[PDB]
Write a protein that binds this ligand. Sequence first.
Ligand SMILES: [Zn+2]
Ligand SMILES: [Zn+2]
Lengths: 293, 293
Amino acid sequence: GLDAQLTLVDGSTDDVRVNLTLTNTGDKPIRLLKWQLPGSDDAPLFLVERDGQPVSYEGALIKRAAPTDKDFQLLKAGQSLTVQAEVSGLYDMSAQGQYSIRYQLPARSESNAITLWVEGVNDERVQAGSVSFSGRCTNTQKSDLLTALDAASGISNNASSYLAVDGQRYRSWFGAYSSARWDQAETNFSKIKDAIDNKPLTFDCSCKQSYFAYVYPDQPYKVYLCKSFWTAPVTGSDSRAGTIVHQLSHFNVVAGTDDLGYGQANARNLAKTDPVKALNNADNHEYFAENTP
Amino acid sequence: GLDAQLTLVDGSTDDVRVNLTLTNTGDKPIRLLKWQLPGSDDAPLFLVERDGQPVSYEGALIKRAAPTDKDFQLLKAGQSLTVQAEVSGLYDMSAQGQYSIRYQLPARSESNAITLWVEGVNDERVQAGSVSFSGRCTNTQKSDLLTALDAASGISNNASSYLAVDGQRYRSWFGAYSSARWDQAETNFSKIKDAIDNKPLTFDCSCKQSYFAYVYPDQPYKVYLCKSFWTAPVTGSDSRAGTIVHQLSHFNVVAGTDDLGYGQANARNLAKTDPVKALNNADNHEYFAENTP
Ligand SMILES: [Zn+2]
Ligand SMILES: [Zn+2]
């Protein structure tokens, strides 16, 4: 027969990783549908409950045709296959509480349940402004993102306060003074602040490219984080907080900023060279907010 | 110096491919910022105008740090590099008319302009219901998708009409009759029809996986098409039209269908075995609408 044993992995992030051992206890090989083994494609393979109530599935749903021979994994007689899954990135395990997790048996009926207390992401934005996730953001990621968002709120309020008392910081990132350009920058930060505070934001963690993040400017307010987001400091230069300000600025409904080159020296040269371009550049907005130093 | 020559590629799809030749005409190697050469990462590298007016950039915007040595491409003295780009997937070239396209010179100022008449995607949905795109859908793709959408509308109206006169087709895909389950199916198709007709749909062409499509059920109404969408027939079994019905059915605001296995035999067994599961399965909805035969 087919035996499925789930065990919790011990670690010190807030992620919820599990080891699933599937074992052919019979005497002839069996075939397991690969789409129903945990892996890089999303499917709802687990029953996740908090305090006896099902939580949301948070992954994608795929159309696949009927499977063919190539779609099945062979397990020999006696043989075990162990696969690890991170569960918090595919089910909503954001609320604190006692959870049970079982795996459903793949096509050729459940593992044991495991149970654990989950600290959760203790934030009203995840339970006007809200924050949702996709692309397998784990509890640690979600928590890191909310942290980054509060930091971003801190620097976007600080930018906005600076701009409300109508100037080196402005000079550095936006160039020679004009009231029209200052009012424009102030309007941009007002809208960035209003998105941080009040809009339905979405962060996605699927991107593995080496840069920081990307958005589609006509698809508010979903920000895709990439590898350099995670390696960046929460605050300071080219920081997580600053990245959020950068990316939010691109949305057509926020500030419609452009990509007019990349980096601090680029940004400084724009300011010195062509204030109108600086006013239209995401980086200049980020660096004005980061104000580091 | 650096010379940039753009030429149009002749072909018989509606895509707009161009060959960009960059040439170091000087005597020492030069370095070209790779991020500003056309490639797999989106940036707005071209000036695209229709009838002398700029059209929208339709690609993503990325945060990158200042570039380092590794980010520059070397071009030797005398040397040319030719790179091809498809332009309709990154700028809005959906309206019929006369277009000019120039490339902006990368960091180390424009190519010649090329001009061409573009047939466009001649559809009010792209100019209540609308259709937007991301993930580099070309004019041919956009046109194929609108075609598929009209086909999907055809089969979703036909499903809805069938369900309005209150039964083999129902039996095949939804199992034994009950008024509650029939009303539920009718409500599901009413909402699928209303999304096809009246909602802001988004199709994305970036996915290269071998299956048909995927959605996030909490991210309406963006459908990601994958390789099997393009190889599928427009109508019939496992068709483009049917895929759209499948995927739209998954959205929480449409019909909240599940992924309860994959394929026609799966679907038929659900119906025979467990009508409540069939009523909750995307495929059963697709196959009921495809009704092939
Ligand atoms: Zn599906
Ligand atoms: Zn950017």
